[PDB]
Each structure stands twice: as C-alpha cells, then as structure tokens.
C-alpha cells in the first residue's frame, strides 16, 4: 500500500552489498572457483534482499523458496550486468575481479558475450538505478510464478500479480517524473521488460553451463527463527 | 509508417494457417514423429508470415535468418498456447491432435505442464487475437536482437527497436480502444510482456529436450527469387 517514491526508497535501501573476490592479491593470478565462491556469498545477501522486497514475505515460505529457486541466477546476472555498465567490454564480477572476453575462454565466452551485450544495451538506454532495482524485483516475483503446483495458491498468485502491477506503476512514475511523454513511457517500459526475456535466456544457458543451491538450502536460509 | 489499426489489420491478415497432423484417422493411435512432422510443415508457413510482419523484410537476409533461428521455437510455442486457450488441460497441437497431460508421458510432461499454465494464464487475462499477433511479432523481432555479431548492424538494430516501439504503440492503442484506463493499459502491457520471458524459458527447455532447422535451411527458405 506504499507510494511510488516509497517503493523506490525501500528498494534502494534494500540493495545488497558489493562483495569482493577472495583471491590473494599478492599471489599470481582458478577462475570458476572464484566465481562460485562469489556466487555462494552473494546468495546469503540475496535472501536478505528478497525479504525486503515489499510483499515478498507476505507469501508462504514454500512460495518464497520457489520464487528464489527459479530466479537466483537471473538476479546474480542482472546485478553483474548493472555493475558492468560503465566498463565497456568487461564484466565487473567484483571490484577486484574485472575480466574481459579473453579471460572467459569451454562454453563460457558465449555467455560472457551475452552478458556484455546486455550491459551495453543498459548503457545505450541509460538505465537508472531506480529502474534497475524495480527490474530486479520484477525478476524475483515473475520468474517462478508460472511454475507453481489450492485456494491458498490462487491467493498467492493474485498477491504476486498485484505486487508486480505496483512495480509497473512505480516504473511509469519514474519515467513520468523525468519528463518522458506518455508515448515514451510505454515504449521504455516495454524495452526494459523485453530485456528480462534475454536475462531469462542467459540464466537458462548458465544453468546449462553449470551441469546450484538446493531447495533445502534455500529453505534453511529463508526459514529463520 | 502505418497506423495502429493498419498494423493490426496487416498482422491479422498475415496469420499462418492451422495445419493438421498427418496420422491416418482410421488406424490405431508415434507421437514425436507426428509433432516433428507438424513443426516441419509449420516452419514453411512461419517464413511466409515473418516476411509479412511490417519492417521484417527491410532487414538484411542474414539478419532475417538470425531472428528466425533464435525465435522459431518460441513462435511455434506461443501459437500452440493460443490455439489451446479454450481447451483447459489440453494442448491443441492440431485440430485432429488434442492431447492431455497423460499423453505427454522422458522430460516431455514438464514442458507440457509449462505450456498448459501459459494457456491458462492467457485464459485468465482474456488475451485477444489482436494482442496475440502483436506479441508473436515482438518475439520475432526481439528474441535474437541481443545476439547479433558494423555500421549496417547498428542501422539494423535501430530499425528493429523502432519497429518494436511501433508494436508497443499498437498494443496500447488496442487497450485504450477497449476502454482500459491509462493505469490499466501500462499494467496489461507489462503483464503481456512478462509472459514472453516464460515463453523464452519454455523454448530453452524445449531446445534442451530436442538435444532443429539449420541456418542454411532457414536461409534457403528465406533467400527466394
Ligand atoms: C550449494 C549451492 C550451489 N552452488 C552455489 C553456487 C552455485 C554456482 O553457480 C554459479 C557459478 C558462477 C557464477 C558466475 C557469477 C558469480 C557472481 C555474480 O554476481 C554473477 C555471476 C554470473 C555468471 C553466471 C554467468 N557466473 C559465471 O561464472 C560465468 C560462467 C560462464 C560465463 C560467464 C560467467 C554464478 C553462479 C552452485
Ligand atoms: C531440419 C529441421 C529440424 N527439425 C525441424 C523440426 C524440428 C523439431 O522440433 C520440434 C519438435 C516438436 C515440437 C512440438 C510442437 C509442434 C508443433 C507446434 O505448433 C508446437 C510444438 C511445441 C512443442 C515444443 C513443445 N512440441 C513438442 O513436441 C513437445 C515436446 C515436449 C513437450 C511438449 C511438447 C516443436 C518442434 C527439427
């Protein structure tokens, strides 16, 4: 029941920290080990973030876990692409781990190139931080909403779509706040949401190039006392 | 440079025919063979359709092929989900091939269930035929736009986004024509586009469950005299 500006403030405040890779800087420069360790540590902070997305903790624990299980790689990937926006040609996995295309060379450079093209698309659109946090919330709420297994589940899915509608309202409020015409507002909303299809694509490719946090582990981190 | 109503008319006129499965009806009821034969025959009509999507033939042949190669399974899948909308619990692969969940039983029922849930989502939204043809055009133009390999390619990608923006305008015109408020218009536009992320998901799962028309075959059907 919050306002658009309140939605944005809460989302901005909820942002996870930017973690560092744990490689010893004084030692020679093991890549996938570093990327898995980073992803492992970000997951914990991504659970704290998800619980702060307005409306998320109103869901059942089982539904929170399902949404996180479907979305976690997309959320890591959109965060990467956002961090990398102002580093053309490179991916800022961490402030001490900025890699270019050649450092990603089996099947890794393909996904690398996809992430770079997304970061470039974000650059050309001049994606704003307020828009980014809205998009990341949309991913959390949307990526698992069509794969649920009851009266309660109907209530849950209705709640999810009401929260999504509120983020849509917030995105349009941001573009209206900045002077875009009503035509430009619809167009940018559509351009931003179609990028989410590409992030899903890269997530599936990445899930494939990784063959992952278990349901039980997600539930254990989400089932707090 | 057409109007919204002209856009819709052209898209509706371009719709491919609904093909039949070639199984002999007088003989006992071979499933994947029937589904592959159907998909094979629909591809030819999907090329004719793509050339009628306003703006598509303005692209280079190489770019048309790339867009079709990335999108073809999503286009078959959204067509299926649209045909199946008014057959809850079943998938209308063809008018003589309406199958339920049990007939899809390795790894086939998973995708089956995903298609059914999309068809149900379309049902609940009361997706209109004018909206469907717009969405199918968006898929054609969007699914391969972030995976292109020049000054010409910059021109192509700018053209693609202008055509996408025009379909966004058309979708909003349809919802405004029907009396939705400006708030409801943005919300439904967003709901429709987020379903496209799920169609991409199912396409990747299906590409996986199929491991496909070659670049050369697509080029041969698209490179007409
Ligand atoms: C018990 C839990 C099971 N584990 C818990 C970790 C889990 C391993 O998944 C992993 C492993 C690696 C990653 C990184 C990573 C790290 C941080 C980031 O912010 C973003 C990313 C993005 C990313 C997805 C492309 N990546 C890669 O390496 C990559 C690969 C090929 C091409 C380019 C990049 C992400 C997730 C399985
Ligand atoms: C030289 C060219 C190479 N070939 C040219 C054909 C190409 C085979 O790909 C195929 C094979 C089958 C299909 C169908 C099909 C048919 C018609 C339709 O309208 C829609 C669909 C959807 C669909 C995607 C889920 N499907 C399945 O079976 C299915 C599988 C598991 C669960 C549920 C459904 C689609 C494409 C490879």
UniProtKB/Swiss-Prot annotation, chains A, B:
Its PTM note reads: Phosphorylated by cyclin A/CDK2 and CK1. Phosphorylation probably enhances transcriptional activity. Self-association induces phosphorylation. Phosphorylated by LMTK3 in vitro.
Which parts of the sequence are annotated with region: Self-association? 1-225
Query: Reported effect of changing residue 53 to E?
Result: Has higher transcriptional activity in the absence of wild type ER. Inhibits transcriptional activity when coexpressed with the wild type receptor
Q: Which residues carry this modification: Phosphotyrosine?
A: 215
Segments forming domain NR LBD: 3-225
Region: Transactivation AF-2; residue ranges are 3-225
The record's tissue-specificity note reads: Widely expressed. Not expressed in the pituitary gland.
Effect after changing residue 75 to C: Loss of transmembrane localization, no effect on peripheral membrane localization. Impairs activation of estrogen-induced activation of NOS3 and production of nitric oxide. No effect on binding to ERES
Name the residues where the record annotates lipidation as S-palmitoyl cysteine. 134
Q: What effect on the protein does mutating residue 64 to H have, as reported in its record?
A: In ESTRR; results in highly reduced activity
Q: Tell me what the record says results from residue 134 to A.
A: Loss of hormone binding capacity and temperature-sensitive loss in DNA-binding
Similarity comment: Belongs to the nuclear hormone receptor family. NR3 subfamily.
Q: What interactions and quaternary structure are annotated?
A: Binds DNA as a homodimer. Can form a heterodimer with ESR2. Interacts with FOXC2, MAP1S, SLC30A9, UBE1C and NCOA3 coactivator. Interacts with PELP1, the interaction is enhanced by 17-beta-estradiol, the interaction increases ESR1 transcriptional activity. Interacts with EP300; the interaction is estrogen-dependent and enhanced by CITED1. Interacts with CITED1; the interaction is estrogen-dependent. Interacts with NCOA5 and NCOA6 coactivators. Interacts with NCOA7; the interaction is a ligand-inducible. Interacts with PHB2, and UBE1C. Interacts with AKAP13. Interacts with CUEDC2.
State which disorder the record connects to this protein: Estrogen resistance: A disorder characterized by partial or complete resistance to estrogens, in the presence of elevated estrogen serum levels. Clinical features include absence of the pubertal growth spurt, delayed bone maturation, unfused epiphyses, reduced bone mineral density, osteoporosis, continued growth into adulthood and very tall adult stature. Glucose intolerance, hyperinsulinemia and lipid abnormalities may also be present.
Q: What is this protein called?
A: Estrogen receptor
Q: Which gene encodes it?
A: ESR1
């Amino acid at each position: 029941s919050l306002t658009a500006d309140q939605m944005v403030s809460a989302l901005l405040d909820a942002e996870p920290p930017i973690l560092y890779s744990e490689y010893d800087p004084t030692r020679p420069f093991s890549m996938m080990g570093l990327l898995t360790n980073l992803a492992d540590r970000e997951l914990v902070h991504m659970i704290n973030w998800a619980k702060r997305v307005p409306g998320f903790v109103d869901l059942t624990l089982h539904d929170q876990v399902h949404l996180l299980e479907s979305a976690w790689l997309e959320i890591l990937m959109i965060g990467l692409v956002w961090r990398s926006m102002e580093h053309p040609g490179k991916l800022l996995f961490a402030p001490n781990l900025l890699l270019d295309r050649n450092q990603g060379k089996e099947g890794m450079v393909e996904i690398f190139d996809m992430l770079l093209a997304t970061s470039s698309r974000f650059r050309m659109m001049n994606l704003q931080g307020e828009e980014f946090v809205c998009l990341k919330s949309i991913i959390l709420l949307n990526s698992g909403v069509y794969t649920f297994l009851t009266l309660k589940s109907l209530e849950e899915k209705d709640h999810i779509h009401r929260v999504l509608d509120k983020i849509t309202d917030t995105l349009i409020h941001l573009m209206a706040k900045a002077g875009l015409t009503l035509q430009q507002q619809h167009q940018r909303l559509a351009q931003l949401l179609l990028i989410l299809s590409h992030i899903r694509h890269m997530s599936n490719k990445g899930m494939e190039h990784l063959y992952v946090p278990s349901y039980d582990l997600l539930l254990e981190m989400l089932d707090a006392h």
